[PDB]
RNA sequence: GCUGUAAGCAAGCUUUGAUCCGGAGAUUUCCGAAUGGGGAAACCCACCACUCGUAAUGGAGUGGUAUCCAUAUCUGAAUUCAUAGGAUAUGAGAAGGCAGACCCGGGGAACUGAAACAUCUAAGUACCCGGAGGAAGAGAAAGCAAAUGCGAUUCCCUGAGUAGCGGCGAGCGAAACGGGAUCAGCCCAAACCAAGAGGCUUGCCUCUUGGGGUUGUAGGACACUCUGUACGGAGUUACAAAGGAACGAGGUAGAUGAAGAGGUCUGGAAAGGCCCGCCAUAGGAGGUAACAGCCCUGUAGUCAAAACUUCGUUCUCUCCUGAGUGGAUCCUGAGUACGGCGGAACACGUGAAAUUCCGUCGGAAUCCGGGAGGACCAUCUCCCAAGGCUAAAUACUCCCUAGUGACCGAUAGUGAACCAGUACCGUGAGGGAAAGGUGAAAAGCACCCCGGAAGGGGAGUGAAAGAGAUCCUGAAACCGUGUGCCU
RNA sequence: UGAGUAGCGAAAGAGGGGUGAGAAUCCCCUCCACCGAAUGCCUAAGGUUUCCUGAGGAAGGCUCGUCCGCUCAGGGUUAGUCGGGACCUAAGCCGAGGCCGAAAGGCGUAGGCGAUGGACAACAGGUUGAUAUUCCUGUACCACCUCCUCACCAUUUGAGCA
């Protein structure tokens, strides 16, 4: 997934994905309080997909230094 | 060392000499399922699901070092070698040099 | 109490009695509280009287 | 950070949630270290339905047991939050 | 193939190479030296900049904000200069920890012995406190030693329980010579000279920088003859510091890897008996349904690391003269060495007591000098204290790999083979347990009968079910039930 | 072993019905009885879920036990005005600098902590199987700030903050 993401820019993508990966995550913790969208391993996509994108950012601070 | 699913003899045990393929492997416990070998009757609770319960006719799996592959040609119980150009360590079966 | 120009201290030893027993005594070194030039300016540190009887400026 | 989204976690569906949700007040857990006015940041900016009040309890954990092995529940901090009149609701539906 | 314990269910992920294992990072809420401040550890409250948002207050994120010290810079009191002090920035400074050890230094007992006990011993032991380093300390002579002398310290063995010390009693007890392990020596200070500054009555003499200068039958200065500024030597561990970059070999992951299902028998199972074949630089071990060289993981041999390291060699880089001759004179370690008084360490307990080190008084020579040669003096032999650096030989382990036990086999071995410093016990410092094994695998007993349900009896499961949840073996005390003979 | 022995922890229950396999000990009703300056309520010190519901019942209950403060499975505590911190201080404690002392530290200035004190704005009802001067229904009150409206000043010969 990294090569799909370093070609993505900082501004126009980490905005629109991570906040919408939150919109995938946080809409799903609500359903985990209910159980209607069962699909339980869709979480471990989403939170783990956050965790790789957020260390590209902190990498680029070293790359900006 | 054996994978699912190569052709498999049974070295020793109660089923000494039957053959079959591999339904599943369990590599952390070093133990492999074979069809129809160590066929064991098991009593089961009535499930949820199925409601039948009854007796099942599964196989408890077999330790790995009571299992050999075969030459495709001779059909012999043979030990394993390796080293194959453009084959990513594909098994040289002894009585050289058949793959897989 | 440990002075400045040298390293005079309290080196505690024994008071050997007559018909020795013998108990313990602190021996703090001699001191007078006098002016001594340091980084600007003096005053003040304890001095040792061996270092004050002819030495740096009082 | 601190975003509106990570502040909330879930709604809490009890027998209390039956009667309160019909009276324009809703139950939510909040994180352990997030105050009352951070809750008004959520519902305004997540749900778009304006907060009347925020009321925040917190619970200690029941020290449960399994076998020999005894241990304590994680601590919970809920929030009954009221909304305005003429404003909808964006629950499970 | 994977979603750890965990034995099941859902949801999923993977040879567009997943699960795993290593290297290098990033992430790393809060407390804790805690360091903005308060604090009753896991929490509250601030302020300064910047951001988000509301009309604003309120609210939220991002860093900074201690203390000491040092480098500077502004200020700069009574008090005039000026200082104390105050403000500011810079410091990949340092406070904390822990390998419960080993090594220095400061403090430092008692109990025990001496058959009592107070001199002594125990013992400079334990304990407390400051130091750090992987080692530390010591060290190139004011050394031993008395000849044809040895040449820095350290460690080991002798020397030897000898010389000795001791109410000479208990007990303490060295050194030097001999033989090894390891093996390297050098800079400062002082005169002399150069450059600054800084005063004095020009003169004169007083601090730093840079050379020079490292000593003992004396060396240096100074002067006079040489000799170089290299291609010779050194070098980051002392010797002065300090940089890189290449070649090889280990380490943190590996990969290859020989030979048989030999047949038959016993069996639940061969790995076992018998009759047999092979491999072997591999017959180390550990699994394998039971005791395998040949079934497996491996073993013996070989070979590999993108990245981190640790080591050895080179290159780069950096740095550098050594001697003779004399002595007109100037240096060679000052409130220091020694000496009195009082103590301690030396094996030496204040002694015929050398020696070292402290407190306090005194207090010299400085080469025609001076110190050691167990009080002291002359002669004679060594040797220059009053400055500093010094790897290795050594002692050590909480540790990390690989390994070995005439070590233990669960009342043993660590307290802990078991979710152990847990449970409990204590206000608290602290004390501190017990607890291993179904089976080869759950095949962990479907179904029927009794019973509310545990708990059984049949049925199947497996070799065993008397093996079925303290679950292999099951002894004895005990508790039963039947009894043959006696009451 | 003692030994089916001592003990079963002051203190009135009784009767009908119900639950369940089983009832004196569980529930309900009805009579009776005890405390009533406490055995009443409210809320500290502490305790950390013992609270409520729904099931069980082996174990703890000094006996049973359908029951429990036991076991499970869920549920349960809403504050600008109440106690405490965005206020202050007492004895005491800590303490920059400072002073003494082999070390470690002892004390202590300026400072700061530290209620049991001083200051301090909300009340009367309802409400559930569980929370209340919190939820809610009516009034209020407290401080701060202004996208607004008006009233009154003054323009440093100065309103006001003070």
Helix/strand/coil (H, E, C) string of D44-93? HHCCCCCEEEEEECCCCCCEEEECCEEEECCCCEEEEEEECCCCCCCCCC
For this entry, resolution in Å reads 3.8
Helix (H) or strand (E) segment spanning residue C33: strand C32-34
> Does A34 sit within 8 Å of D92, measured CB to CB?
yes
For strand F, is any atom closer than 7 Å to the CB of C18? no
Q: CA of B99 and C1' of E93: distance in angstroms?
A: 67
For strand F, is any atom closer than 7 Å to the CB of D88? no
β pairing state of D77-83 and B92-93: unpaired
Neighbours of chain A (3+ CB pairs under 8 A): D
E-state strands within B16-100: 19-20, 25-26, 31-32, 39-43, 55-59, 62-63, 67-68, 80-81, 92-93
Given a contact cutoff of 8 angstroms between Cβ atoms, the answer to whether B4 and B25 are in contact is yes
Residue B69 CB-density burial (10 A; 0-12 exposed, 13-18 middle, 19+ buried): buried
User: What span, in angstroms and rounded, lies between the C-alpha atoms of A42 and B22?
Assistant: 32
Tokens at residue D60, please?
């200690």
From chain A, the residues in CB contact with D6 under 8 A are 22, 26
User: What span, in angstroms and rounded, lies between the C-alpha atoms of A46 and A18?
Assistant: 10
User: In Å, how far is D92's CA from the nearest CA of chain A?
Assistant: 7
> Does A36 sit within 8 Å of D9, measured CB to CB?
no
Tokens at residue C9, please?
């201290």
User: What span, in angstroms and rounded, lies between the C-alpha atoms of B56 and B41?
Assistant: 6
Residue D89 Cα distances to A1, B12, B82, D84, angstroms = 37, 69, 66, 11
Q: Strand F: which residues 22-51 of C lie within 7 A (CB)?
A: 26, 28, 33, 44, 46
Method: cryo-EM
Residue B39 Cα distances to B8, B16, B59, B62, angstroms = 16, 13, 4, 11
User: What span, in angstroms and rounded, lies between the C-alpha atoms of D60 and D72?
Assistant: 9
From chain D, the residues in CB contact with A36 under 8 A are 92
For strand F, is any atom closer than 7 Å to the CB of D10? no
User: What span, in angstroms and rounded, lies between the C-alpha atoms of D44 and B80?
Assistant: 68
């Amino acid at each position: 997934m990294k090569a799909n993401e370093i070609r993505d820019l900082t501004t126009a993508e980490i905005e629109q994905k991570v906040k919408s990966l939150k919109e995938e995550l946080f809409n799903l913790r609500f359903q985990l309080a209910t159980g209607q969208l069962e699909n339980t391993a869709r979480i471990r996509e989403v939170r783990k997909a956050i965790a790789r994108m957020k260390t590209v950012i902190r990498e680029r601070e070293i790359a900006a230094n | 060392h054996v994978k699912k699913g190569d052709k498999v003899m049974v070295i020793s045990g109660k089923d000494k000499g039957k053959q079959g393929t591999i339904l599943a492997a369990f590599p952390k416990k070093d133990r492999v399922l074979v069809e129809g070998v160590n066929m064991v009757k098991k009593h089961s609770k009535p499930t949820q699901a199925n409601p039948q319960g009854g007796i099942s006719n599964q196989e408890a799996p077999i330790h790995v070092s009571n299992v050999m592959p075969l030459d495709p040609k001779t059909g012999e119980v043979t030990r394993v070698g390796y080293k194959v150009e453009d084959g990513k360590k594909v098994r040289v079966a002894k009585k050289s040099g058949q793959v897989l | 109490r440990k002075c400045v120009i040298t390293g005079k201290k309290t080196t505690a030893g024994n008071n050997r009695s007559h018909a020795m027993n013998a108990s313990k005594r602190t021996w703090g070194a001699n001191l007078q509280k006098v002016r001594i030039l340091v980084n600007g300016k003096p005053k003040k540190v304890y001095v040792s009287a061996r270092a004050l009887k002819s030495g740096k400026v009082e | 950070m601190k975003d509106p989204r990570d502040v909330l976690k879930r709604p809490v569906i009890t027998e209390r949630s039956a009667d309160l949700m019909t009276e324009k007040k809703y139950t939510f857990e909040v994180d352990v270290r997030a105050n009352k006015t951070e809750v008004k940041d959520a519902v305004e900016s997540i749900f778009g339905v304006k907060v009347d009040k925020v009321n925040i309890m917190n619970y200690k954990g029941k020290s449960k047991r399994v076998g020999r092995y005894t241990g304590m529940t994680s601590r919970r901090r809920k929030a009954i939050v009221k909304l305005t009149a003429d404003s909808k609701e964006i629950e499970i539906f």
